[PDB]
Amino acid sequence: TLSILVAHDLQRVIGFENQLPWHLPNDLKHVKKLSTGHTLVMGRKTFESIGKPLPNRRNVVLTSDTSFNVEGVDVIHSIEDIYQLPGHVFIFGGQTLYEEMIDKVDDMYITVIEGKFRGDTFFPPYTFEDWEVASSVEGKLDEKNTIPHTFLHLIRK
Ligand SMILES: NC(=O)C1=CN([C@@H]2O[C@H](COP(=O)(O)OP(=O)(O)OC[C@H]3O[C@@H](n4cnc5c(N)ncnc54)[C@H](OP(=O)(O)O)[C@@H]3O)[C@@H](O)[C@H]2O)C=CC1
Ligand SMILES: COc1cc([C@H](C)C#Cc2c(C)nc(N)nc2N)ccc1-c1ccccc1
């Protein structure tokens, strides 16, 4: 399976100055549950924003840098390399990778953050004309989770 995994706001912001614009522990839990024991594929910049691989899953980084080597990280140098990765593979960011992959994925797991944040990086536009809502689950508001959010699972029609 090839899936997108993304959190974006009401205007499809995903990032600002190499960081997530919001703090939402519930969403990190959602990522952990979905991707543990599977594979994440991310662009070089997304990886460096996090700085280290996420535990208990395969971390694959896409870069043109032939010197790129990080312990606990597998490197690929082409989009075509993604299709040869076994198991459930989640496209994990950022903007460039999403733009390259949105047309190709089976599936999207989107956390819609119901706010308008300042951003410099964006998820590409998409229409529900192309995507069936497999599930839509409201995130629970919390002392630690104070932004309304909805977990969408979208499947290509
Ligand atoms: N939610 C998110 O996903 C988050 C993303 N961001 C940010 O996104 C911002 C914008 O950068 P963006 O480019 O979208 O980030 P990406 O994660 O998509 O990384 C881009 C890099 O990935 C590599 N890459 C992408 N496509 C290819 C390809 N076809 N062939 C070879 N290498 C490829 C290149 O690395 P290289 O230059 O090494 O060759 C490229 O510069 C960054 O500032 C990043 O911090 C910030 C916070 C969160
Ligand atoms: C999982 O940890 C992260 C992941 C990222 C990357 C950019 C991501 C992502 C992502 C999230 C958070 N949610 C969903 N649904 N999809 C994603 N691709 C950025 C910062 C962090 C992070 C780093 C340190 C502390 C807290 C969060």
Side-chain angles (χ1 to χ4, degrees):
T1 317
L2 190 56
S3 312
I4 272 170
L5 179 56
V6 65
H8 75 63
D9 81 357
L10 291 168
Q11 301 180 309
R12 282 170 291 98
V13 169
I14 64 170
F16 181 69
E17 293 187 332
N18 256 69
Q19 297 187 352
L20 300 173
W22 48 78
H23 181 241
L24 204 56
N26 282 351
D27 177 62
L28 305 180
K29 280 201 149 208
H30 175 72
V31 174
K32 186 180 177 184
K33 198 192 71 52
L34 251 33
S35 63
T36 292
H38 303 104
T39 302
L40 300 177
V41 174
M42 67 199 85
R44 187 264 299 168
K45 295 191 183 173
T46 294
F47 176 74
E48 293 295 347
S49 81
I50 73 177
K52 57 178 190 302
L54 285 178
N56 309 138
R57 72 212 85 166
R58 192 184 185 184
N59 291 246
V60 170
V61 172
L62 182 55
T63 177
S64 68
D65 185 354
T66 58
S67 291
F68 193 88
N69 177 289
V70 178
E71 216 289 328
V73 169
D74 300 332
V75 187
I76 57 165
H77 301 293
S78 178
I79 284 291
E80 327 295 342
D81 293 342
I82 293 163
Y83 309 117
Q84 269 68 52
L85 301 165
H88 201 160
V89 172
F90 295 90
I91 304 304
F92 200 59
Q95 169 168 174
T96 62
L97 199 49
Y98 291 138
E99 288 174 349
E100 293 173 286
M101 298 302 295
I102 189 154
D103 341 68
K104 306 285 186 282
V105 298
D106 303 313
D107 232 25
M108 306 200 293
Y109 293 89
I110 300 177
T111 307
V112 181
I113 314 286
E114 317 280 0
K116 290 186 180 177
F117 290 78
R118 170 168 299 106
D120 56 25
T121 59
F122 284 81
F123 193 73
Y126 60 96
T127 51
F128 288 98
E129 163 208 294
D130 297 343
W131 302 91
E132 162 137 74
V133 181
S135 61
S136 176
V137 183
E138 282 190 40
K140 294 284 166 73
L141 288 204
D142 198 79
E143 326 89 8
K144 288 161 164 54
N145 298 270
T146 42
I147 330 172
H149 55 286
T150 306
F151 305 105
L152 299 182
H153 183 207
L154 270 20
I155 308 181
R156 190 184 301 281
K157 287 182 181 173

